[PDB]
Amino acid sequence: ICCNPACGPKYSC
C-alpha cells in the first residue's frame, strides 16, 4: 500500500 497522495500512481489504502 501507499496511502498518501504523494505516492502518485502507487496510491492505495
Curated annotation (Swiss-Prot):
The modification Cysteine amide is found at C13. Expressed by the venom duct. It is found in: Secreted. Disulfide bonds join C2-C7, C3-C13. Belongs to the conotoxin A superfamily. The cysteine framework is I (CC-C-C). Alpha3/5 pattern. Negative results: shows no or weak inhibition on neuronal nAChR alpha-3-beta-2/CHRNA3-CHRNB2, alpha-3-beta-4/CHRNA3-CHRNB4, alpha-4-beta-2/CHRNA4-CHRNB2, alpha-4-beta-4/CHRNA4-CHRNB4, alpha-7/CHRNA7, alpha-9-alpha-10/CHRNA9-CHRNA10. Alpha-conotoxins act on postsynaptic membranes, they bind to the nicotinic acetylcholine receptors (nAChR) and thus inhibit them. Is active on muscle nAChR (IC(50)=113 nM on adult subtype (alpha-1-beta-1-gamma-delta/CHRNA1-CHRNB1-CHRNG-CHRND) and IC(50)=142 nM on fetal subtype (alpha-1-beta-1-delta-epsilon/CHRNA1-CHRNB1-CHRND-CHRNE)). On mice muscle receptors, its higher affinity site is the alpha/delta nAChR subunit interface. On Torpedo receptors, it does not distinguish between alpha/delta and alpha/gamma acetylcholine-binding sites. This is Alpha-conotoxin SI. It comes from Conus striatus (Striated cone). The chain holds residues 50 to 62 of 64 of the full protein.
